[model samples]
Target: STNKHLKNNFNSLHNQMRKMPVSHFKEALDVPDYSGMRQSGFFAMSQGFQLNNHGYDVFIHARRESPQSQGKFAGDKFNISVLRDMVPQAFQALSGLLFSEDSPVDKWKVTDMEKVVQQARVSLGAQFTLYIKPDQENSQYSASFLHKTRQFIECLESRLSENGVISGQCPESDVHPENWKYLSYRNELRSGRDGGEMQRQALREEPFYRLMTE
Candidate 1:
């Protein structure tokens, strides 16, 4: 039920952000992921989408990765990456949680929902992970993550409404593939579970690839 709530809200936001379905996102998904840079074992495969509001660009990215090697430093992790221009500022906002390196998710497990969002707003290129750690409540941590996500989306919409009025065009070539728009996931986390999926989950989900062919 918790996972369902997290998944559903993400799905809902994806729908609400669309401009009634068009073309570029389909084209965006067809383009290969950028691989110019990478983190040791953290990989990702990102796709860009044009938001309906203010025509802003949003990248929906995921991570399902294994470790760099067999050691205490290596372990699997999962998260969703949402990128948009000027989603910048206070990258340190949620990085506050990074302080709990010993048991990060567990620390967040009991964090207040509003507090979590407050930290995140001050931050996308934001991240929400699914690696429920020891002494942690899975659903609660998931809720904290989902709450952060939901608040961030709300923040983005608000920003676009206020700022998109003059600049809704896509970002410069530097942000696009090879010049791709979504590059933060440039590491191993960029790709999916393995070889690939029936289609990238980014391209397969309802409003994501929902219009790929059209």
Candidate 2:
């Protein structure tokens, strides 16, 4: 019961990425068109591969500010501050790679993300949705990040669902599977997702029924 309460919001995961290299978001799992090119994206290593938040722990969180088309710099080029911490670990896991786990005992040998993810594929599906900040001047950057962030969330969600890794344990003490599933539901919602996309995905995928029914 002590763990049910939400603690102060944290950005420790983002702090860890500065020491590591930028690991990026792949184009798409189903597409085979990398074409020997990779762009800087929200998947950078800051806030990388660390469990900063609780529950449904595998998320690569990122936020970016695009070049302002009509700002003080006017038609200038500047790209940058993508927040991190969500699914960075998922990518790291496939490769046994982790900024948080960088250590003398580290055993991760594979440097190829593609090959690493291969061993960890399977029901992972996702969706795309956009949210707007609404009613504000110079609000495009904030609102636009909402859509792009969701896009990448869907990208990682696709992999997770396909893998059938719903996350966390079914209650250890509960006798009935339904009760266990119920606790899991309550547990995860509290962990950090709250009313976020992962929660939406949980509802959309009907994981409650899937885990509870079986």
Candidate 3:
């Protein structure tokens, strides 16, 4: 029951932030349709992952705004925002570290940066926080959705190499030592153990019905 309830909550937010279908997500991940970027001048990808042990949910977002049709480059490139805090600010720090001059990812430059960690509850039991970069005006990095996503994860790993905590700095990336797990959209419904035919009907008929009926 807990698994189904958590799965439903994860799905609720995952579905809300997504514009593309699960098929496209599967194609991008190079995996079968389970449940599940960067463009400089404009694009978006909404995906989520979970953490082991603690079992925390994470939502990642990246956006680019280009009004010009031929505009290959744009201003104020918004980078990845890791939903939830402590972890969120730490990610911003890692972004700074990677994007800093002389770094491998220096192509991304941050002229003026702003961070707003907004926490809000959307839909019952679906509360979330957003780490936003409102002014990445001079920043621009274009790469495939999965490519950039991995790059972000890579940045976190890079930071860990130097014992980043030495600077009295902390954020989502290194806040927790556990490995992060990405959630997927499974094709078949999860079995409810003892539910047999009646439970099958409940899940197939309505998720909420099964939740409450259980």
Model 2 TM-score? 0.22
Give candidate 3's whole-model lDDT.
Answer: 0.27
Q: Where is model 1 more than 4 Å wrong at Cα?
A: 1-141, 165-214
Instruction: Arrange candidates by TM-score, descending.
Output: 1, 2, 3
Summarize candidate 3's per-residue lDDT along 98-205 as a digit string, tens digits.
Answer: 322222221222111112234332211111121212122332221222133333444444454343422222222111222322100111234445443444343434
Please report the candidate that would top TM-score against the real structure.
1
- For the record, the alpha-carbon RMSD of candidate 1 to the native fold, in angstroms, is 17.6
Q: Write the per-residue lDDT of candidate 1 for residues 2-106, one digit (tens) a residue.
A: 333334566554444443332111112232212211111233222211111111212222222321112121112323233323332211222222221221222
lDDT of each: 0.26, 0.24, 0.27
Model 3 shows how many backbone clashes?
10
Give the range of the ten consecutive residues with the poorest summed lDDT in model 3. 31-40
| C-alpha RMSD values across all candidates | 17.6, 17.8, 18.0
lDDT for residue 8 in candidate 1, whole number 0-100:
59
> Between candidates 1 and 2, which one is better according to TM-score?
1
